[PDB]
């Protein structure tokens, strides 16, 4: 969206994990059909995210880390992202509306 416009921000979930196999937890777990939240919850340690369900929802451009975006930004359909390696850790994007 716009600089700074109504709809600049993206609606994302994620979930933070150390290891790219808890990433994969979350990914192959999602496929259960199980709430993201319930995942982010469980898994992530993103606890502001956890408290969120890993519902980041809306959030500005360059704010995360590029791969996060960039994983936001290619699955804005709302397919599970890859894990999403960060400064931070892994993280597992999903799409949120």
Known sequence: GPMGSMADKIKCS????????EALAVQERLK???K???????????G?????DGSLGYFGRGKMVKPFEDAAFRLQVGE???????????HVIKRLG
Do not use: N, T
């Open 32 to 34: 259960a059909g199980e």
């Open 80 to 90: 599970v992202s890859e894990p999403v390696k960060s400064e931070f850790g892994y």
């Open 14 to 21: 994620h979930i933070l994990v150390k290891k790219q196999g």
């Open 48 to 52: 502001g995210s956890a408290k969120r």
């Open 36 to 46: 993201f939240g319930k995942l982010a919850k469980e898994l992530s340690i993103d």
